[PDB]
Amino acid sequence: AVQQRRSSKHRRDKRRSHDALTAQALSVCQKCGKKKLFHRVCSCGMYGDLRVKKAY
Amino acid sequence: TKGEVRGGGKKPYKQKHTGKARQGSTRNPHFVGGGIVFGPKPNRNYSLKLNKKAHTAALHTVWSEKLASDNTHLVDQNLFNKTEGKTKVMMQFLKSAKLLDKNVLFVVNTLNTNLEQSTSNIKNVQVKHLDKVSVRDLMLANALLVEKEVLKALEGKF
Amino acid sequence: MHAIVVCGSKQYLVHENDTFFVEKLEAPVGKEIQLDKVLMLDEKIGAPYLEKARVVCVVEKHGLQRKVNVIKHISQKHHLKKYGHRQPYTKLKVVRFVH
Amino acid sequence: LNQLKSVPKARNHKTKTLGRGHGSGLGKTSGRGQKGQKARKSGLTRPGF
Amino acid sequence: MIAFAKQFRVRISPQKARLVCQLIVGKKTADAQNILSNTPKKAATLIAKLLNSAIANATNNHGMNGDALYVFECVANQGPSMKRTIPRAKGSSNMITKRSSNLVVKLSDNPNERQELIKQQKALVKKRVEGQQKAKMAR
Amino acid sequence: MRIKGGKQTRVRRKKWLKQASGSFGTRHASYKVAKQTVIQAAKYAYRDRRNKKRDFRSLWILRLNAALREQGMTYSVFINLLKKHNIEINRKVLSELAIKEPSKFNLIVQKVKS
Amino acid sequence: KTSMLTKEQANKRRQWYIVDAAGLVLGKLAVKAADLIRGKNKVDFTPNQDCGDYLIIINSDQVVLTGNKKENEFWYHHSQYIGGIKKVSGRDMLKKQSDKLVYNAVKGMLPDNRLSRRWITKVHVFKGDKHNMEAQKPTTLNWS
RNA sequence: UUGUGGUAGACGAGCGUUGUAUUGGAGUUGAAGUCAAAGCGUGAGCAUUGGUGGAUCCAAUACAAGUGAGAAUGCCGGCA
RNA sequence: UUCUCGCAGUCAGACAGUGGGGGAUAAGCUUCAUUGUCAAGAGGGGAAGAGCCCAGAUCAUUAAAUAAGGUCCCCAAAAUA
RNA sequence: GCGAAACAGUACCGUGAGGGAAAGGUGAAAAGAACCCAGAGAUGGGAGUGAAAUAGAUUCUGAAACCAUAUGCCUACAACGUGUCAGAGCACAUUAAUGUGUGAUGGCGUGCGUUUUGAAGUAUGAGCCGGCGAGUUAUGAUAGCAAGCGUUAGUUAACCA
């Protein structure tokens, strides 16, 4: 469907206002020097302290 | 004008099924493509009729103003000589005659070469002959050095 | 204590130590004017108009009213007549009294 | 009366331009009503009509 | 305290860049670098590299604290986008645009560095008021 | 003789823009719509220069009549009392301000007694 | 040029009052409540400076109505649905809510204004005389 | 004294812009154009200030106007 | 309002009354003569408004006295019998 | 302004006759941002150059509309072309000016043309900004105003200097 008139910028910004993005959850990774996002693996490839997979 | 510009007369749009203006031409004077019918027209006369009686009356009045202006002191034929084209001595003369800022006009009927080689380097001075002097040129100067032979001829001319 | 004066067609209740604007009454700046078309100064009133009652006032400036832009128009009929309005007035204040 | 001062004696009378201006007439109707045949280009039919 | 880092024409829509960077404006870099290295956004690496270059310039080229720096303001400017024609059904076409962006972010050290802008604006309007006053000082 | 002629039009449009300010967003930056809103505001101003002048009278009359009926006598009978005896010309606003300066309306209400 | 009118700003005061409804009839009590709340009884009335006070109306149920009116004129309330008109009579409202009836009457009697909604809730109306609203030290202003 | 609504429509009186003729002025101490400001104007308009700007412009009188912009489902460029 | 000269627009009108033509002495119907209005001119009363009633405006003024109309409250003005 | 200030009738369009655009500007002299830092690099930042780097090759300039963010204020029970006049509250202090900036609330307030009997309209037109955009001239005539001449005036056309 098509509106008979152009949409006001105020509904543009007000409707887009719901698109605010939440922040990421983080953790504390001690042996690897990383501030790792929660319940994931760190840049060292250690998830909960295990060198499960090689760094490179 | 419309037909003076190059371009084939045809409708780029179909007359129906188009929401824009009619636009029944590729080029249209409301475009930038041309077709202007209101511009410079090279057909005017650039002339206006003026009778000789009124013109002669205007000349009589302007020469009356000149003689009454009093800043029309007389000169002689012999004084037009004594120089080849040396304006510097003539410049000293004219500043000694308190003319530097206002235009200076010379009247002549003998066409002396000494004056014409001079007074032809500065916009503040120019010579002109009685047959070719016009009312504007007379009042363009406000400062004239008049010769002695124009007097009787001008009086007899009326 | 106070007075009521009539300037133009408007009444003004003025006490002491009060400054105010009124209509232009052809008064030079810094001069003293006795005002007579007054009413109800202090237990003093006359029936049609108050008699033998005045009030001193001192003018301090002449001014012009705020320039309003009166653009009176008839729409769809091309009427668009425009004018700018400033109205003269005098700012003045009373001094002590006079009766 | 010089080039620095030139004023005529009662000339430059009332002119009329019908293409511009709207606060003093001479706009779209241009002082000749509306919907006349003469409003179309090249009106003013032959005087013998 | 400018600490800016201009980018000048990487091809990305600033509409999404503003939306992703409200979450980092006014906050430090230590708590932001980790999250930007982890956020699932296209401009994450771009903004991370830009802020790293800005920090390097601030520390080396000028010399400041680093422990109290934080993003002063977001801005993702709209430069010249590029227009390309796309064909469609029934021999029709549309004229779509691909957006670019200028990225520049200043870094501030104190809880201040905003008010002096108003102070200097007031100064430049004052010098105007003395300029106007001097106009009537002619005798 | 071709003249670009662009500065005068932009100056006139700047003046039109400066006619009003602080409007509802797009209105204070839309030239034609701003002009129309300015015209509507001028109509408001003229119509109001009529209405407020006619309505101050009603406001004063009401605010007096409230007290007068709280004093026991209506506004119209008060006007008649003025008319029939001791006709004192006074503004309804000034009778208001007489209340704002207390201990003086008592002189009026004792003077109205014929 | 200047005779500027003076009205108080940011100055407000609201008192508690007591009014009866035994001999009263809806119209006169309604107009008196309306011009009391609405400020038509203050020498210093200001349209935007809290012209209203607090009112308490007691024993509304014994109000007298002129006979068949109680079943002649009907009070309707329409819901969001078709046939949503619920229609009641005077005898029904007299035992269920006449305080709401006088509420409706005075709200339709008051100007439909942004402040009038705050004006209309300034009055506490009860069919009895034993409740919490009597602990605010009210004033016996009846027939007012 | 009479007024002073006013369509189309008639009249009268005006303002502004470009440039030519001249007088005159101003001009890196900063022209034009520019934005910004809390003026003067009965109106077409006229200032002032401060910063950008980097080199002509304006005051007065006439003359000739590609001489006066909101609409033309107008045209172009950019922007939604 | 008569005379001359210049410039035109105007012949797609509408409403109401008074009296008529048609029709159903029907229609906010059509066409008419007169009266006024709107077009071309706004306000106040009619809750709303081109034609209805009172009306016929340079502008401004925190003034008064009135017309139609109105005076239980909305919404400004009164009561007495 | 020749369509064309440039490798212009060019690119491009059709298969072909034919149709047919756009875009110029560095600084004084490039001395064109050498050297360092970050990054893969572009690039950015320093530093340097230079009178100036709001002179950085993105280049004479840089309004509007368009998109943002922030100074001070208001706003999440409210029937509004969102404004006027009153109006606190707040934050200030000017082209010293009956000061400015925002406006809780009160009173009231159904666009601009267009053609039209008559449109606030659900008739049409407009997304916005900028630019551009439509009563000239020739030969005469009519009438007015003004000027000149003047009652055997006056005018010269073409034409020559």
mmCIF file with all atom_site columns, N, CA, C and O in Angstrom, chain B residues 11-35:
data_model
loop_
_atom_site.group_PDB
_atom_site.id
_atom_site.type_symbol
_atom_site.label_atom_id
_atom_site.label_alt_id
_atom_site.label_comp_id
_atom_site.label_asym_id
_atom_site.label_entity_id
_atom_site.label_seq_id
_atom_site.pdbx_PDB_ins_code
_atom_site.Cartn_x
_atom_site.Cartn_y
_atom_site.Cartn_z
_atom_site.occupancy
_atom_site.B_iso_or_equiv
_atom_site.pdbx_formal_charge
_atom_site.auth_seq_id
_atom_site.auth_comp_id
_atom_site.auth_asym_id
_atom_site.auth_atom_id
_atom_site.pdbx_PDB_model_num
ATOM 1   N N  . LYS B 1 11 ? 7.616  14.784 -29.845 1.00 0.00 ? 11 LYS B N  1
ATOM 2   C CA . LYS B 1 11 ? 7.349  14.585 -28.425 1.00 0.00 ? 11 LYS B CA 1
ATOM 3   C C  . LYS B 1 11 ? 8.187  13.435 -27.887 1.00 0.00 ? 11 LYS B C  1
ATOM 4   O O  . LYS B 1 11 ? 7.965  12.282 -28.281 1.00 0.00 ? 11 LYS B O  1
ATOM 5   N N  . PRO B 1 12 ? 9.154  13.689 -27.001 1.00 0.00 ? 12 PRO B N  1
ATOM 6   C CA . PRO B 1 12 ? 9.841  12.565 -26.344 1.00 0.00 ? 12 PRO B CA 1
ATOM 7   C C  . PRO B 1 12 ? 8.904  11.726 -25.495 1.00 0.00 ? 12 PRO B C  1
ATOM 8   O O  . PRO B 1 12 ? 9.089  10.508 -25.381 1.00 0.00 ? 12 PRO B O  1
ATOM 9   N N  . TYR B 1 13 ? 7.897  12.352 -24.894 1.00 0.00 ? 13 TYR B N  1
ATOM 10  C CA . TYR B 1 13 ? 6.901  11.628 -24.121 1.00 0.00 ? 13 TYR B CA 1
ATOM 11  C C  . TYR B 1 13 ? 5.725  11.226 -25.003 1.00 0.00 ? 13 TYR B C  1
ATOM 12  O O  . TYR B 1 13 ? 5.419  11.873 -26.008 1.00 0.00 ? 13 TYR B O  1
ATOM 13  N N  . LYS B 1 14 ? 5.071  10.133 -24.623 1.00 0.00 ? 14 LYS B N  1
ATOM 14  C CA . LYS B 1 14 ? 3.759  9.836  -25.176 1.00 0.00 ? 14 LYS B CA 1
ATOM 15  C C  . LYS B 1 14 ? 2.722  10.748 -24.533 1.00 0.00 ? 14 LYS B C  1
ATOM 16  O O  . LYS B 1 14 ? 2.739  10.969 -23.318 1.00 0.00 ? 14 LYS B O  1
ATOM 17  N N  . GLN B 1 15 ? 1.821  11.288 -25.355 1.00 0.00 ? 15 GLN B N  1
ATOM 18  C CA . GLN B 1 15 ? 0.832  12.244 -24.865 1.00 0.00 ? 15 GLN B CA 1
ATOM 19  C C  . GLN B 1 15 ? -0.047 11.671 -23.761 1.00 0.00 ? 15 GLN B C  1
ATOM 20  O O  . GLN B 1 15 ? -0.521 12.434 -22.912 1.00 0.00 ? 15 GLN B O  1
ATOM 21  N N  . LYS B 1 16 ? -0.264 10.361 -23.744 1.00 0.00 ? 16 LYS B N  1
ATOM 22  C CA . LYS B 1 16 ? -0.981 9.693  -22.671 1.00 0.00 ? 16 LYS B CA 1
ATOM 23  C C  . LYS B 1 16 ? 0.002  8.847  -21.873 1.00 0.00 ? 16 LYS B C  1
ATOM 24  O O  . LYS B 1 16 ? 1.155  8.654  -22.271 1.00 0.00 ? 16 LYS B O  1
ATOM 25  N N  . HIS B 1 17 ? -0.468 8.352  -20.731 1.00 0.00 ? 17 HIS B N  1
ATOM 26  C CA . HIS B 1 17 ? 0.297  7.466  -19.852 1.00 0.00 ? 17 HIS B CA 1
ATOM 27  C C  . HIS B 1 17 ? 1.581  8.111  -19.340 1.00 0.00 ? 17 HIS B C  1
ATOM 28  O O  . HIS B 1 17 ? 2.572  7.414  -19.094 1.00 0.00 ? 17 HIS B O  1
ATOM 29  N N  . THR B 1 18 ? 1.591  9.432  -19.173 1.00 0.00 ? 18 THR B N  1
ATOM 30  C CA . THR B 1 18 ? 2.728  10.145 -18.607 1.00 0.00 ? 18 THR B CA 1
ATOM 31  C C  . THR B 1 18 ? 2.224  11.155 -17.589 1.00 0.00 ? 18 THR B C  1
ATOM 32  O O  . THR B 1 18 ? 1.351  11.971 -17.899 1.00 0.00 ? 18 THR B O  1
ATOM 33  N N  . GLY B 1 19 ? 2.775  11.102 -16.379 1.00 0.00 ? 19 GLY B N  1
ATOM 34  C CA . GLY B 1 19 ? 2.364  11.978 -15.304 1.00 0.00 ? 19 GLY B CA 1
ATOM 35  C C  . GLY B 1 19 ? 3.069  13.310 -15.230 1.00 0.00 ? 19 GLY B C  1
ATOM 36  O O  . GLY B 1 19 ? 2.686  14.157 -14.417 1.00 0.00 ? 19 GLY B O  1
ATOM 37  N N  . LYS B 1 20 ? 4.092  13.529 -16.052 1.00 0.00 ? 20 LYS B N  1
ATOM 38  C CA . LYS B 1 20 ? 4.789  14.803 -16.066 1.00 0.00 ? 20 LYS B CA 1
ATOM 39  C C  . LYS B 1 20 ? 4.025  15.798 -16.938 1.00 0.00 ? 20 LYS B C  1
ATOM 40  O O  . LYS B 1 20 ? 2.982  15.481 -17.518 1.00 0.00 ? 20 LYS B O  1
ATOM 41  N N  . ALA B 1 21 ? 4.549  17.019 -17.033 1.00 0.00 ? 21 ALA B N  1
ATOM 42  C CA . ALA B 1 21 ? 3.913  18.048 -17.842 1.00 0.00 ? 21 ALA B CA 1
ATOM 43  C C  . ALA B 1 21 ? 3.842  17.619 -19.306 1.00 0.00 ? 21 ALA B C  1
ATOM 44  O O  . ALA B 1 21 ? 4.474  16.646 -19.728 1.00 0.00 ? 21 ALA B O  1
ATOM 45  N N  . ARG B 1 22 ? 3.049  18.360 -20.084 1.00 0.00 ? 22 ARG B N  1
ATOM 46  C CA . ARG B 1 22 ? 2.848  18.040 -21.492 1.00 0.00 ? 22 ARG B CA 1
ATOM 47  C C  . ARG B 1 22 ? 4.153  17.920 -22.267 1.00 0.00 ? 22 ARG B C  1
ATOM 48  O O  . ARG B 1 22 ? 4.370  16.889 -22.915 1.00 0.00 ? 22 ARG B O  1
ATOM 49  N N  . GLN B 1 23 ? 5.023  18.930 -22.195 1.00 0.00 ? 23 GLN B N  1
ATOM 50  C CA . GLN B 1 23 ? 6.364  18.888 -22.774 1.00 0.00 ? 23 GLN B CA 1
ATOM 51  C C  . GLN B 1 23 ? 6.353  18.396 -24.216 1.00 0.00 ? 23 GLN B C  1
ATOM 52  O O  . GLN B 1 23 ? 6.988  17.385 -24.536 1.00 0.00 ? 23 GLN B O  1
ATOM 53  N N  . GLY B 1 24 ? 5.641  19.098 -25.093 1.00 0.00 ? 24 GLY B N  1
ATOM 54  C CA . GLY B 1 24 ? 5.485  18.648 -26.462 1.00 0.00 ? 24 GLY B CA 1
ATOM 55  C C  . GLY B 1 24 ? 6.629  19.009 -27.386 1.00 0.00 ? 24 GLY B C  1
ATOM 56  O O  . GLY B 1 24 ? 6.426  19.197 -28.588 1.00 0.00 ? 24 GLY B O  1
ATOM 57  N N  . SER B 1 25 ? 7.842  19.102 -26.843 1.00 0.00 ? 25 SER B N  1
ATOM 58  C CA . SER B 1 25 ? 9.009  19.423 -27.649 1.00 0.00 ? 25 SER B CA 1
ATOM 59  C C  . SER B 1 25 ? 10.265 18.964 -26.923 1.00 0.00 ? 25 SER B C  1
ATOM 60  O O  . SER B 1 25 ? 10.316 18.929 -25.691 1.00 0.00 ? 25 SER B O  1
ATOM 61  N N  . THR B 1 26 ? 11.283 18.610 -27.708 1.00 0.00 ? 26 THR B N  1
ATOM 62  C CA . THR B 1 26 ? 12.585 18.275 -27.140 1.00 0.00 ? 26 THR B CA 1
ATOM 63  C C  . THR B 1 26 ? 13.225 19.501 -26.501 1.00 0.00 ? 26 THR B C  1
ATOM 64  O O  . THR B 1 26 ? 13.773 19.429 -25.396 1.00 0.00 ? 26 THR B O  1
ATOM 65  N N  . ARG B 1 27 ? 13.164 20.635 -27.190 1.00 0.00 ? 27 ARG B N  1
ATOM 66  C CA . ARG B 1 27 ? 13.644 21.910 -26.684 1.00 0.00 ? 27 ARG B CA 1
ATOM 67  C C  . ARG B 1 27 ? 12.479 22.880 -26.555 1.00 0.00 ? 27 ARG B C  1
ATOM 68  O O  . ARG B 1 27 ? 11.590 22.949 -27.407 1.00 0.00 ? 27 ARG B O  1
ATOM 69  N N  . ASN B 1 28 ? 12.498 23.645 -25.467 1.00 0.00 ? 28 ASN B N  1
ATOM 70  C CA . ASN B 1 28 ? 11.371 24.484 -25.092 1.00 0.00 ? 28 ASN B CA 1
ATOM 71  C C  . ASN B 1 28 ? 11.932 25.698 -24.372 1.00 0.00 ? 28 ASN B C  1
ATOM 72  O O  . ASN B 1 28 ? 12.796 25.544 -23.500 1.00 0.00 ? 28 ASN B O  1
ATOM 73  N N  . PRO B 1 29 ? 11.498 26.911 -24.728 1.00 0.00 ? 29 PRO B N  1
ATOM 74  C CA . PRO B 1 29 ? 12.108 28.116 -24.139 1.00 0.00 ? 29 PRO B CA 1
ATOM 75  C C  . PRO B 1 29 ? 12.163 28.136 -22.619 1.00 0.00 ? 29 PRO B C  1
ATOM 76  O O  . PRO B 1 29 ? 12.952 28.907 -22.060 1.00 0.00 ? 29 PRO B O  1
ATOM 77  N N  . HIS B 1 30 ? 11.363 27.329 -21.924 1.00 0.00 ? 30 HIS B N  1
ATOM 78  C CA . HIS B 1 30 ? 11.519 27.253 -20.477 1.00 0.00 ? 30 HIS B CA 1
ATOM 79  C C  . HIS B 1 30 ? 12.582 26.242 -20.054 1.00 0.00 ? 30 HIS B C  1
ATOM 80  O O  . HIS B 1 30 ? 12.826 26.095 -18.852 1.00 0.00 ? 30 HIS B O  1
ATOM 81  N N  . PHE B 1 31 ? 13.209 25.548 -21.000 1.00 0.00 ? 31 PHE B N  1
ATOM 82  C CA . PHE B 1 31 ? 14.412 24.769 -20.744 1.00 0.00 ? 31 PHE B CA 1
ATOM 83  C C  . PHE B 1 31 ? 15.637 25.672 -20.785 1.00 0.00 ? 31 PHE B C  1
ATOM 84  O O  . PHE B 1 31 ? 15.542 26.889 -20.961 1.00 0.00 ? 31 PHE B O  1
ATOM 85  N N  . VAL B 1 32 ? 16.805 25.048 -20.616 1.00 0.00 ? 32 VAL B N  1
ATOM 86  C CA . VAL B 1 32 ? 18.063 25.707 -20.942 1.00 0.00 ? 32 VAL B CA 1
ATOM 87  C C  . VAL B 1 32 ? 18.490 25.442 -22.377 1.00 0.00 ? 32 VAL B C  1
ATOM 88  O O  . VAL B 1 32 ? 19.504 25.988 -22.824 1.00 0.00 ? 32 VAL B O  1
ATOM 89  N N  . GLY B 1 33 ? 17.739 24.620 -23.110 1.00 0.00 ? 33 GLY B N  1
ATOM 90  C CA . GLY B 1 33 ? 18.124 24.291 -24.472 1.00 0.00 ? 33 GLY B CA 1
ATOM 91  C C  . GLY B 1 33 ? 17.968 25.446 -25.440 1.00 0.00 ? 33 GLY B C  1
ATOM 92  O O  . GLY B 1 33 ? 18.530 25.420 -26.539 1.00 0.00 ? 33 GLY B O  1
ATOM 93  N N  . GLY B 1 34 ? 17.213 26.470 -25.055 1.00 0.00 ? 34 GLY B N  1
ATOM 94  C CA . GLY B 1 34 ? 17.030 27.623 -25.906 1.00 0.00 ? 34 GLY B CA 1
ATOM 95  C C  . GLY B 1 34 ? 15.601 27.779 -26.391 1.00 0.00 ? 34 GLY B C  1
ATOM 96  O O  . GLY B 1 34 ? 14.670 27.097 -25.953 1.00 0.00 ? 34 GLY B O  1
ATOM 97  N N  . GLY B 1 35 ? 15.437 28.711 -27.325 1.00 0.00 ? 35 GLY B N  1
ATOM 98  C CA . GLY B 1 35 ? 14.128 29.031 -27.860 1.00 0.00 ? 35 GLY B CA 1
ATOM 99  C C  . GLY B 1 35 ? 13.613 30.365 -27.364 1.00 0.00 ? 35 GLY B C  1
ATOM 100 O O  . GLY B 1 35 ? 12.459 30.729 -27.613 1.00 0.00 ? 35 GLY B O  1
#
